[PDB]
């Protein structure tokens, strides 16, 4: 029953947003990044991007794809062309809607990039990504063998749960490949099956909504004075701050978010066994930690005198 899950991001389209670090400078990117969440334990993060996943360029379902917005025309590539990295390369697991799930190492940035023919697209964001160990032994890469604590990692399926984001009317995405000059006037050519609207300032205050017609206007000489917007009544976007909004109550629905933080099981390491030397009312502890290990002691009386210590070197505690 995956088609019942995917059917709500069919109402939506990918968009372009402002990314601060692109391949050269500051650009408008089709793969812009809204938020990175890293609160699952063993290295799984969940990116909310400005692209869409698990859908094809039409609206139907293709398996491992990124769907993006390239200056209005929606394009697509396979998922194995898209790579992202924090410090080391991350590994993309799955995608659903505006959301992506990756297995990432710890780092102070996220950079997603894909490669078209001779254009390289990138988007680096200053979003901190952390790695959260489980248990009282602080590893950096999850181990090979040990025991199994309970944990909380981002679930890998796109099951509808009780958490939502809010969708809206896309506003007037302005264009300038529409407006062009005649030999003596200004010419607006809206695309087929799409209505534009034109605001100019060459007479007094001029404004028009045009449909499907190469519609010239007299008294406008230079095309710097006319802005040709674009309109799409269908096809929701996210409530982004990198997009402008429409006029009047703005709201069209809400969608569920995939890959929520669920309870699970995680494998944790097991420290080398301490070597215990006994004496008269005293206990010595030889400790050889492989990776840093909390020692926590307490006494079973009315004053516990608890001791809490991160130990990362070979140490003897009496």
């Amino acid at each position: 029953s995956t088609e019942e899950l995917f059917n709500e991001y069919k109402l939506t389209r990918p968009y372009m947003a402002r990314c601060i670090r692109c391949a050269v400078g500051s650009c408008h990117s089709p793969i812009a990044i809204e938020a990175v969440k890293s609160d699952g334990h063993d290295g799984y993060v969940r990116l909310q991007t400005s692209s869409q996943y698990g859908l094809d360029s039409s609206g139907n379902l293709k398996g491992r794809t990124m769907r993006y917005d390239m200056h209005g025309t929606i394009k697509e590539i396979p998922l194995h062309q898209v790579s992202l990295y924090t410090s080391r390369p991350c590994h993309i697991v799955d995608g659903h809607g505006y959301f992506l799930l990756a297995r990432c190492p710890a780092g102070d940035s996220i950079t997603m990039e894909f490669k078209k023919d001779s254009v390289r697209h990138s988007c680096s964001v200053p979003y901190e990504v952390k790695f959260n160990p489980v248990g009282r032994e602080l590893y950096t890469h999850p181990p090979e063998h040990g025991v199994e604590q309970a944990c909380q990692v981002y679930a890998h399926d796109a099951q509808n749960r009780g958490a939502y984001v809010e969708m809206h009317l896309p506003g007037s995405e302005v264009d300038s490949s529409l407006v062009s000059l005649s030999g003596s006037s200004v010419t607006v050519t809206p695309p087929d099956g799409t209505s534009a609207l034109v605001e100019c300032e060459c007479g007094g205050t001029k404004i028009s909504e045009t449909i499907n017609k190469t519609k010239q206007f007299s008294q406008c000489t230079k095309k710097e004075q006319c802005r040709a917007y674009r309109l799409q009544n269908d096809k929701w976007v996210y409530n982004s701050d990198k997009l402008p909004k429409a006029a009047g109550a703005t709201l069209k629905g809400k969608l569920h978010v995939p890959f929520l933080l669920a309870d699970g099981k995680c494998t944790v390491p097991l420290a080398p066994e301490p070597m215990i030397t006994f004496g008269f009312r005293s206990v010595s502890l030889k400790l050889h930690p492989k990776n840093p290990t909390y020692l926590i002691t307490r006494q079973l009386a009315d004053e516990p005198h608890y001791t809490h210590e991160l130990i990362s070197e070979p140490a003897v505690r009496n």
Binding site: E4, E8, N233
Partner: protein, 50 residues
Amino acid sequence: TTMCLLANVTFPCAQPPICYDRKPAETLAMLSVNVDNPGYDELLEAAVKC
């Protein structure tokens, strides 16, 4: 039970009159006014499929 709205026609939320593969923007407008609804997920998964 929960009754959803497109007009003054309180239809059952499991039985919508329209679907997205028929209408591009009327389904989105029907979902627009019915956001404050405890049966919005029922209206949602019914309003996709015919």
